[PDB]
Amino acid sequence: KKINKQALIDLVEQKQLKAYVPEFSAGDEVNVAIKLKEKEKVRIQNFTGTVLRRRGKGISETFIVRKTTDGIPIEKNFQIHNPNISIELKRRGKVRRAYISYMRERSGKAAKIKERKQ
Template structure:
């Protein structure tokens, strides 16, 4: 009887040690991923290249389009309705209405496909995400300009 109890205790102790090791490994792994992300951002260095913009602003994104062996730049102008994540995974969503059809496009901020970003107009928004603009058309979908 006592041998069985001792074996069970040893197994419980071993489980606790492996769980503790797993936790420290996860912490180390998380730290190394954060370091890699910082290095990646330092290499790309888009922070100084693009202007500072927020949700509600109207921006013009010049995107590189590669068709076969030809390359051209296409402008996509619209209102920023969302900015998500941070670091190298930062994305922003731009909404525009063209010929009565609403289109939204999600751009990775640090993508090499983005040639340049121009700030057309600052908009006044009191929300972090402007998804309510999806239900609006015409003048009701236009945000007031920030002075």
């Protein structure tokens, strides 16, 4: 009657995981298509921006996307394995950390991440 709690939690999480779950590092630019539902239909709204963090293990995997519109910077936390949300990695960039917090302090020409990564 030994109970591996982590395994049971993993099974509940597997019930609703996704197949692809594309990868991205901290400093990456992705395109997030929100399937916003009105009374009818869906309006696919894109939230293209730069990733800042990807934390979590399973159904609770979340990532941070930062965008700038009209000079106003907005940061948005998405859940990876959340329906009506589609992620498409666009550019892979090089960073030396996992949580690039300085992006919410540095802006303009100093907020540009060089490409390539390993």
